[PDB]
């Protein structure tokens, strides 16, 4: 059910959020892997140079936008968890509606472009949020 | 209040550029095989997307691209370890070449040149068959000839026992991504689609190569559908996919002697020796009355696009190159260049059979591009081929008092795997998200 | 020793698992190092581009097996540790032992091969499991 | 920002943490990658073979260092964060500089120079901490 | 109850075929290629109460060596002089010494050569191997090298060194090399002494065909090993616990010329030998040789029953490559007439030395490839090597009539290899477990 | 009271060496190579406090871009054209033009060459430099390209353009460039005014012996920079605060011929003269010159005594590219006497005759050699002089003489690195603090 439901409702994600988290890594770079290596194709991705470094391009992106995911989670406090909540509260700017009117009223790919623009100004409230807190718990370290 | 949530491994995605990779089904050396090497999965999946939307545009898409760059890198790879024809460049005795009771064919040249061998200072004369395609004159008032390719670039010899059959190619996303494919049957291309399924690889398409008509694709599943990046700027290319292919066969007949010549150390160079049997020419033959329900539904069809009254015309092109101006083909490894006179000749206002003449060129500038020619070996034997016309490749002459006139055009290989790509979109996931909430973060 | 106690018996074998999880990348920051040493040593594998692009994959790879595993960890609420326990109950279905006939009188290779065919099933319902507690905890933050 | 607290007095450098656990990873790698995609860099370069390879190695350099501190901050317990303490007591003996000047009057650079010899010796406390405290939490939970 | 408890860190692996690489320790390829630096002080690591299946047949480090060892061979080839230009009509005569005393073995050929520029040639003469040179036709002294037919060759380059040298291999991070020291240990089956590490032992990486030269001896007493001993189409390895001392030699002193082929490409082959000549030949102890045979006659009555007949004799047939003993001497290619040895009869069981009359050549097709082919560059003065015999290469005969007959084998060198990586094992560590506990998480 | 705590993203570095990315801004050959844009980079971060100790006697970067712009080099010629048919016996004669006027150099010869049937061969006549060609045995109109007993030699392709651009080097993630800002900083020891960049300035790969063209302009003062001022082993390298103009040309203006060597193969030489004849030189300003000279000896005399005598006088002895100034202009290949600049002495309208030569051992490498093609017209360019690379030979006491050697080809960079040095980020830190982890 990869992306399954991806047009359902924002509010009822739930196990979507595992099955994505699990198929956008090494999980299923291991099948391709085994794949690839299966015929014994290793002499072709050394004679044909150019595919050969093409794939290595595809896997380090790939490792490399995990990694930014990974990072991004850690910095914000929310490392090893996949629904997380924060002290920062939200904008009236930042396409400000109800939760009657949009909670199971509109589905994750209809309103992230609604938050365009405003990415970078959560993700600096967020870092500064939980620099703070780290902060504040070594001081109540007495 | 509302307070920020954080999800991670939200369903979004974003239009995207990436390299994607190739496979394709377990089986001599045919080098798509060899290439693609990664097998498919023995039961491929599909996901459908229920209530999502999404814009596709097939004349935009990398997937091409991707497609006219991984083919030529791949063509370049396989001929750069096989032997290389390039001290085959002398002066030629030609004279008209005759068959079994020296009857003339037309065509062809009986040549003989000065050849080197094993050693260095050791010369023979051997004696070759080969195309007047291939060939032009030194003197105009006499026998001396040479190969087209000696004032471009030295030309390679496609290795003799590496197969060139066209395999179906899936083509699959790396991780991170995935492939969206249309499921609106009437889908034209640049717009919405509502009916959409995410795929990991696609359903496995021929790398044929064509230049007038669209071979060995896939039928429409509706009526003919005619698809144009600017439907009313006829500059652009027409491409029409049929609901109905149409069966044509095409044949090379004259029984052929193939003949070897050791021209280096290692290095074996194939020609056609003599040939036997009757005068024979290369041909296409095609149903006669196929052809023309097909053309009258394209017409029907075109009449959606253009005024119920206008006046459609079909006529050959106009003429450049013999690349373009004809209907060029594979056929089991030999090159076919067809005039395609009597597909594209008529009017259309509100038992029977043809036959196309053909050309053989074994000298050819693939990808139109200047030098780097390849040599298509000779085939021993007869050449017979069958091949389906799923679609066609037309461009538009207007400016006449309410008349339309098409014609062949094309040429650009791209357009062909247009013809299997317009319904997928390569897209890059976005797991990250964040989402207002009623909750709030504790300690 | 470094596997030591392999063959041994599972619980002194699991007293030392830092050993294990340390070498997955110190090996390949020692590597690394040695070659950094000689730049005349990468200069001439560098010029034997197949040795490079089979070395590239071999280290690829094994960030990619590193991060599989991470990952796997993360998904189960397990991540940042190396020992960890869940809510989710033992089948009798493929193992009937007792702790004492596990965790002593038995090797963590014959564990493998005891419940080679389970450990999937594992992975699924530890994934289950920690989306149901997620959830649970972001309903409970009123 | 990126840093901009280094010559300041460590305690300056806290708040700053945060701008310079960016730019290892994916802070610069992203940049770089749009802007060689942009101009189809590497793939119009493909032929460069050794540009290439060395581009691909040095990625793959950055993410194995980020890998290996991420790595190291989780076998000491209490990663994904930028603060964090141990229940490892300070061995004064390595400077003896039992003063408030570890908050004050001092460079995080000269620090790191001042107690650069004896970083194995802390590692190695950090990790016999963490293994005694997860086989507590595994008895005391047991 | 009992729940779920997840480990990371685990000690447990599986088999595995990674990737591995090589780190060893005058333009040596060996050093150049393994410039990875050698752990100066390996830490094996017994670990107690493991067992470990092996089976050296099945071994993929054998591959691996295999493919990594002709890359070498071929790159170090890659940048070196071509000699095509060389490939012409030879005029050749018996070759001379001192007093006119007649050469056995060589030929003084004369060809004509492009200098430095390439509109003006030069007579060159050169003495060479008459077993690399062939009539060019019928019988005139016009002669040509044996490759010209086959495909072009590239002379080593003559300041590049191929002498063996010790060559760790190591494991890539999350795969360890699994070491059996069970000295007892056939190559096949469960062993109850396995250790981990990080690195080979070293192994030097020796060609050879027929004896197994400058290998490691076995730690107790001669093995015989292979997968059917039954199934004679098997090859079998007989590594010995005692090691045989062998002495080979070109003796003449002969001189080397130094040609000009082209700008930068430099020709080199044997001016002149000065005289006293005598054929080249190894040597080996006669005493030694029978108590080996015999040991080894003993293990085999011990595999095929004491009352059967044993019985050794030359090689049944094959080019050079097979039926002598090859072996590479300081960059010289030596093939040695073995008739001299196994040749006997053992049923229940001499200070001389045996002579070995050895071929001397330069053209070399290494690895049994058509094409590709090597020459070996000449070498002033006089050529002696020594040698540690440490195992054989034999097959057995299907005569039966309680008679087992033994010949020498070879043909394909990954045996070599083998020969000396029968105790090593990689394996993928897994550090992912789980186990049932008696307790829950609290959540 | 003290207890260990670990830091995560401490800004603290180390010293290191890596693979810098190389970007910038018929064809220019840096522009496609290194192929990203620099325009977003208009900031740096000052460093408050920091000291660090910079080396431009050991940087690792000028190595780096010495290695690329030969790997650049070698790339770019690879799938050009090749001239070894050319090596082939000459039927040579004087050139002329006008009335007959006899040329100093232009041997004009003849070949017999192949043509596009190799059982067809033409006599095909060029002018060549002197310089490219050597005589057969002494033997009167035999002669021979000097390549032929060296290598096979590569055509440059004429559609590529080898004119230097604006280079920066951008460090990788994890990585940070240090700048030096002491406007008074002599290449060597502590600086106390540092920034932090994430890409260099604009250094063009400019390629020159003796004297340094199209740098910057050093700072505010004049500086020598020497790994060792006493030493006579070292280079020195002499940066000047002002440009002095020089005005280098090639006036003859010639016909362009081509030649067709095989299948798709194109060779071009210098055809028919056209104009008069008119040697290649370069103009300097006199004046210009000798305060130029004057401020580098008063900052000579501030490390070598203050009553002390100093002098200049030509390279001694070489090959060309030890003794002329060589260098590019308009892609052609000049190599110049400099013995009328570097003859004077100190106690308290120049013309250079210039050399053109097409065949280049660039490098001084053995084999590889390159010819660059001709070009069709007068050439004229003009260079900013920036600096000189000075040679020191010792001597009597209070005798100091200098010589324009062209040093190291890795020193006309260092030039304009000095001030750059390329730093490891470590973010992991540990510190006692009075918090311990609770539980
Ligand atoms: C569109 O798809 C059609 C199939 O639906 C294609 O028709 C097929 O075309 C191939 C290629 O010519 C035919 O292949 C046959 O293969 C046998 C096997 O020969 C083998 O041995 C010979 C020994 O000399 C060797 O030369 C070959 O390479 C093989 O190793 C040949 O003997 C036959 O002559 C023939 O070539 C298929 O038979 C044919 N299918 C059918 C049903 O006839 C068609 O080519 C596709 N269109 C395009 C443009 O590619
Ligand atoms: C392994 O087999 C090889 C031949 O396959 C034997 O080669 C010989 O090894 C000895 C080692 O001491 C070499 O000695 C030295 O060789 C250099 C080469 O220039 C020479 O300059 C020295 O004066 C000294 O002679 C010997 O040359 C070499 N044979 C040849 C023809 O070069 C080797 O002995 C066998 N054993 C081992 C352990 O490698
Ligand atoms: C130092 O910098 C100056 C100024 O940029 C350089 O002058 C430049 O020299 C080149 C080569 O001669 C000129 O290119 C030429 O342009 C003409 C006209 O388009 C063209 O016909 C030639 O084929 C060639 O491409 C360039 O225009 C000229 N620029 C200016 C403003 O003077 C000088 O070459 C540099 N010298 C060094 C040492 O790098
Ligand atoms: C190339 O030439 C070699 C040598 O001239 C040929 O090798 C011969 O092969 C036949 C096979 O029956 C043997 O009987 C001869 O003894 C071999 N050597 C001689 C003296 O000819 C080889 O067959 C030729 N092959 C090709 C493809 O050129
Ligand atoms: C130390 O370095 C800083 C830059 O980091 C210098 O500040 C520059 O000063 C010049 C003076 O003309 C200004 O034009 C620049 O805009 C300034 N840049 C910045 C970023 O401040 C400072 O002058 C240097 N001081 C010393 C001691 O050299
Ligand atoms: C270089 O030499 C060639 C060969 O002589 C000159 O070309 C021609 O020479 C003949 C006389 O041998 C004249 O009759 C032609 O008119 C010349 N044609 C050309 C190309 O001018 C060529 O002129 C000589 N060039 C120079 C500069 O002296
Ligand atoms: C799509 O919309 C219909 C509308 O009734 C709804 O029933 C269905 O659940 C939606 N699809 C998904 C996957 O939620
Ligand atoms: C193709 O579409 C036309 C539309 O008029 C229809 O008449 C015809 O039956 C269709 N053929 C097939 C095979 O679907
Ligand atoms: C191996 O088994 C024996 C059995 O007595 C035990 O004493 C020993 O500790 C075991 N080895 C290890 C490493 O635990
Ligand atoms: C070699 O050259 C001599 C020179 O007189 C000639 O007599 C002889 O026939 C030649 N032999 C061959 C095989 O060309
Ligand atoms: C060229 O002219 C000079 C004038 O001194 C003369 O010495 C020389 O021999 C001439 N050479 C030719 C080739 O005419
Ligand atoms: C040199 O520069 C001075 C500056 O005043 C000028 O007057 C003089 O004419 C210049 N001479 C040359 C060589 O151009």
Chains 1, 3, 4 share one sequence.
Request: aromatic letters at 8%.
């Amino acid at each position: 059910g990869f992306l399954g439901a991806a047009g359902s409702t924002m509010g009822a994600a739930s196990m979507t959020l595992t099955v994505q988290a699990r198929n956008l890594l090494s999980g299923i770079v291991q099948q391709q892997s085994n794949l690839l290596r299966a015929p014994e194709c290793q002499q072709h991705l050394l004679k044909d140079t150019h595919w050969g470094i093409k794939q290595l391009q595809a896997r380090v992106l790939a490792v490399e936008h995990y990694l930014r995911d990974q990072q991004l989670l850690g910095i914000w406090g929310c490392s090893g968890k996949l629904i997380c909540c924060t002290n920062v509260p939200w904008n009236s700017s930042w396409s400000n509606r109800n939760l009657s009117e949009i909670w199971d009223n509109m589905t994750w790919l209809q309103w992230d472009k609604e938050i365009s623009n405003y990415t970078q100004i959560i993700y600096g409230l967020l870092e500064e949020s939980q620099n703070q807190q780290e902060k504040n718990e070594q001081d109540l370290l007495a | 209040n509302l307070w920020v949530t954080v999800y991670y491994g939200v369903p979004v995605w974003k239009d995207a550029e990436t390299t994607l990779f190739c496979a394709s089904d377990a089986k001599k050396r045919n080098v798509w095989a060899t290439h693609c090497c990664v097998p498919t999965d023995p039961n491929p999946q599909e996901i459908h997307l229920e209530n999502v939307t999404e814009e596709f545009n097939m004349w935009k898409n990398n997937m091409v691209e991707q497609m006219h760059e991984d083919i030529i890198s791949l063509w370049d790879q396989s001929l750069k370890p096989c032997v290389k024809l390039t001290p085959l460049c002398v002066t030629l005795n030609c004279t008209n070449a005759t068959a079994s009771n020296s009857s003339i064919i037309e065509g062809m040249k009986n040549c003989s040149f000065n050849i080197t061998t094993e050693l260095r200072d050791k010369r023979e004369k051997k004696n070759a068959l080969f195309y007047k395609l291939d060939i032009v004159q030194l003197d105009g008032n006499s026998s001396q000839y040479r190969l087209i390719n000696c004032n471009t670039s030295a030309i390679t010899q496609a290795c003799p026992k590496v197969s060139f059959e066209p395999i179906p190619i899936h083509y699959c996303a790396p991780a991170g991504f995935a492939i969206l494919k249309c499921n609106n049957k009437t889908f034209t291309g640049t717009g919405p689609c509502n009916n959409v399924s995410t795929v990991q690889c696609t359903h496995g398409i021929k790398p044929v190569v064509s230049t007038q008509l669209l071979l060995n694709g896939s039928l429409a599943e509706g009526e003919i559908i005619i698809r144009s990046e600017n439907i009313t700027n006829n500059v652009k290319t027409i491409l029409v996919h049929l609901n109905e292919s149409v069966k044509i066969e095409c044949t090379r007949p004259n029984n052929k002697t193939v003949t070897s010549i050791r021209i280096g150390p290692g290095q074996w160079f194939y020609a056609y020796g003599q040939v036997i049997g009757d005068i024979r020419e290369a041909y296409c033959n095609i149903n006669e009355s196929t052809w023309n329900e097909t053309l009258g539904k394209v017409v029907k069809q075109l009449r959606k696009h253009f005024g119920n009254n206008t006046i459609i015309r079909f006529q050959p092109s106009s003429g450049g190159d013999l690349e373009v101006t004809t209907h060029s083909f594979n056929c089991g490894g030999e090159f076919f260049y067809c005039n395609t006179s009597g597909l594209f000749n008529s009017t259309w206002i509100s038992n029977d059979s043809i036959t196309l003449p053909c050309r053989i060129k074994q000298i050819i500038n693939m990808w139109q591009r200047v030098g780097q020619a390849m040599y298509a070996p000779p085939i021993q034997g007869v050449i017979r081929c069958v091949s389906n016309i799923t679609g066609l490749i037309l461009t538009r002459d207007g400016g006449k008092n309410n008349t339309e006139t098409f014609r062949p055009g094309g040429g650009d290989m791209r357009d062909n795997w247009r013809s299997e790509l317009y319904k997928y979109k390569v897209v890059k996931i976005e797991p990250l998200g964040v989402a207002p909430t009623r909750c709030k973060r504790r300690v």
